[PDB]
């Protein structure tokens, strides 16, 4: 009976909306028994099968729906969503374009296609497709919120106030009606949502993982209660999609090797395949055990593998970022599970026990913002591998082209050896600073830069144009290897003025909001002899920032844009700036470490979210509390003072340059020991039969 099957299908659509996915599946299946050739039911069943992670089975049913009904546009668009999740972008594109070819007025298909454009980096096209979707279906939370994120990426602040109001309205309505918020947890920090909303958004996304592990029907795992089977060693497993050329490896790649093999056995669980970089080689070589879970796509089998290794503490380095397999944590194969380093926020999830943070980043009085218990590292939870990756930047020299520390810079592993070969190096007190006078050698270096030559040879030493590192050694440029040559970096390479203050910020532009640019405008207005240095990150955001700046009263030539650079050049060119102005909305995190390694003071204003407080935690560990502002007023005054009181700038820059070495900030050895102590407090607490509690001391 058609009427019987219809009722089953329609009831299943209702169960689905209510979050009862298992019951939905049951009813779609009953519908198909009654009426086997029921296209709508095949397509709808396939949608919930996708939600349970049964992708191949979903594809089978979409194809069956389309065989039955060749112009079934819903089935094509839904099938594309499945193909997208399987990383078959071409297949998804073919489905969406077919669906729109069938029904040009199909809003969902326009929004789904826009998501491809967005993920491919084609923001103007994503924006155009999202706008079409919204024209067709004005009430469309997914399209609206993804559109708002596109606009954020390119700094389009048109009707920004109304935009924020609507985003919060949408999230409020979705949370009240028990639906999945269209704002992604990782983006929630960018909008004026309450802390309550932000935790709930994270919590509901974590519950998606549960839908996928419930179908597995696995019993709880039995966890070890002693270290006997591991000979007294604590077994730590690090789980990451980012073992390879990714910011996460640029921060912690040294840590697995620095764990004490007497007290710790380290397991690294890669969620990604080998990208062939030295980052991946290193972690694979230095971890006690390296397990490629990208070869075990079934989450049940992967979790089983983790459990069979006997892991005591399992560490989630992804959170809600691309490549995550949080289903592994939802299965709970380890007694203690902790969030660490990779994701700047709470999981909001029952299945994570601890978040590894610090007092500055996550003060006890805001513990309500987190679903995990706070586990404090003693200084900052943040770490970077800069001392290992870029030791060529530990020392520098300059050329007296007239003395400036940041107009024409030379760095190198072999720098001192080269300076010896010279009979006229002046040493200036400010360690100290070697200055090469304007002689024949200095002229040859400067001519290299002016002529855009790749490299020259002086007294047998190779001296490189800093813009040409990839042509000389591609591994040195990515940070996979330490450069061997003496490298030259100049303000002239980036069109920076030789005789003015350079304020920098090298973050992705999405971190900038109107309030932020206004603050920067004010600073520049008060330091007449100054520019702001930003990146084309992405390039299409540049004319927007320029418009809004001009609108705030700044001529165009006060803001200088540079392309995004290879990792090594990005860190090295930070030495050319006087001061970095951190973004209060979401701080530089990796980018903050990058700037400080260069010796560049960073002005920050910590907010209420974890992501807005990281730079202050880095600065506190570094020992520069004078760079941390308590409000916008102080941020502007600190920045203006650094730009106008040149003796104070010299002092503070010297303080950063010295303390990047003497403070614990870049000390991976000390960091690992402190992390090990925290791991133990976690373990002894559990071994004494206790549930997780704040480790804040």
């Amino acid at each position: 009976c058609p009427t019987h099957a219809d009722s089953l299908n329609n009831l299943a659509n209702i169960k689905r909306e209510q979050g009862n996915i298992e019951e939905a599946v049951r009813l779609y299946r009953k519908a198909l028994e009654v009426f086997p050739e029921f296209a709508a039911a095949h397509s709808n069943l396939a949608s919930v099968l996708q939600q349970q992670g049964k992708l191949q089975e979903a594809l089978m049913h979409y194809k069956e729906a389309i065989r039955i009904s060749p112009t079934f546009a819903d089935a094509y668009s839904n099938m594309g969503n499945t193909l997208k999740e399987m990383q078959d972008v071409q297949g998804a594109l073919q489905c969406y374009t077919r669906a729109i070819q069938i029904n040009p007025a199909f809003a969902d298909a326009h929004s789904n296609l826009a998501s491809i454009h967005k993920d491919s980096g084609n923001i103007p096209e994503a924006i155009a497709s999202y706008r079409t979707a919204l024209k067709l279906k004005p009430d469309f939370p997914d399209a609206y919120c993804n559109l708002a994120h596109c606009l954020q990426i390119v700094c389009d602040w048109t009707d920004y106030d109304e935009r924020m109001k609507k985003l919060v309205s949408i999230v409020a309505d979705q949370l009240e009606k028990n639906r999945l918020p269209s704002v992604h947890p990782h983006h929630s920090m960018l909008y004026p949502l309450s802390h309550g909303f932000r935790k709930a958004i994270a919590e509901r996304h974590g519950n998606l993982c549960l839908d996928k592990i419930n179908v597995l029907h696995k019993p709880p795992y039995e966890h070890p209660k002693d270290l006997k089977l591991s000979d007294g060693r604590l077994r730590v497993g690090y789980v990451s999609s980012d073992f390879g050329n990714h910011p996460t490896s640029h921060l912690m790649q040294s840590i697995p090797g620095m764990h004490n093999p007497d007290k710790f056995e380290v397991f690294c669980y890669a969620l990604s395949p080998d990208d062939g970089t030295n980052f991946r080689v290193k972690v694979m070589a230095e971890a006690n055990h390296f397990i490629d879970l990208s070869q075990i796509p079934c989450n049940g089998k992967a979790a089983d593998r983790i459990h069979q290794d006997g892991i005591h503490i399992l560490v989630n380095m992804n959170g809600y970022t691309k490549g995550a397999r949080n289903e592994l944590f939802a299965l709970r194969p380890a007694p203690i599970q902790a969030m660490w380093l990779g994701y700047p926020g709470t999981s909001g999830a029952l299945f994570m026990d601890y978040i590894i943070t610090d007092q500055e980043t996550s003060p006890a009085e805001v513990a309500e913002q987190y679903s995990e218990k706070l586990a404090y590292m003693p200084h900052t939870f943040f770490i970077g591998d800069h001392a290992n990756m870029f030791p060529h930047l530990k020392k520098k020299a300059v050329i007296d082209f007239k003395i400036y520390d940041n107009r024409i810079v030379l760095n190198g592993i072999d720098l001192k050896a080269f300076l010896d070969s010279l009979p006229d190096v002046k040493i200036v007190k400010m360690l100290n600073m070697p200055v090469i006078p304007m002689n024949t050698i200095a002229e040859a270096v400067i001519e290299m830069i002016n002529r855009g030559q790749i490299q020259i040879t002086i007294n047998g030493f190779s001296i490189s144009n800093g813009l040409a590192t990839t042509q000389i050694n591609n591994k040195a440029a990515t940070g996979e290897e330490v450069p061997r040559t003496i490298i030259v970096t100049t303000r002239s390479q980036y069109g920076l003025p030789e005789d003015a203050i350079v304020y920098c910020n090298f973050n992705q532009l999405y971190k900038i909001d109107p309030s932020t640019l206004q603050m920067w405008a004010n600073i520049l207005k008060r330091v007449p002899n100054s520019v702001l240095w930003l990146l084309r990150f992405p390039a299409v955001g540049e004319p927007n920032i320029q418009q809004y700046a001009q609108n705030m009263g700044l001529p165009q030539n006060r803001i200088i844009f540079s392309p995004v650079a290879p990792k090594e050049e990005h860190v090295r060119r930070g030495q050319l700036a006087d001061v970095c102005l951190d973004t209060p909305l979401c701080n530089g995190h990796t980018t903050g470490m990058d700037v400080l390694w260069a010796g560049t003071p960073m002005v920050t204003m910590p907010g209420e979210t974890l992501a807005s407080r990281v730079a202050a935690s880095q600065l506190t560990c570094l020992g520069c509390l004078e760079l941390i502002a308590k409000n916008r007023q102080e941020y502007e005054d600190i920045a203006v003072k650094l730009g106008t009181d040149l003796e104070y700038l010299k002092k503070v820059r010297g303080k950063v340059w010295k303390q990047r070495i003497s403070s614990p900030l870049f000390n991976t050895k000390q960091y690992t020991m402190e992390l090990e102590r925290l791991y133990l407090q976690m373990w002894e607490h559990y071994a004494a039969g206790n549930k997780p509690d704040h480790m804040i001391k």
Partner: peptide, 12 residues
């Protein structure tokens, strides 16, 4: 990875 929207088809 940007989320997508599944379309539910009602039987009539």
């Amino acid at each position: 990875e940007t989320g997508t929207t599944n379309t539910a088809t009602t039987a009539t």
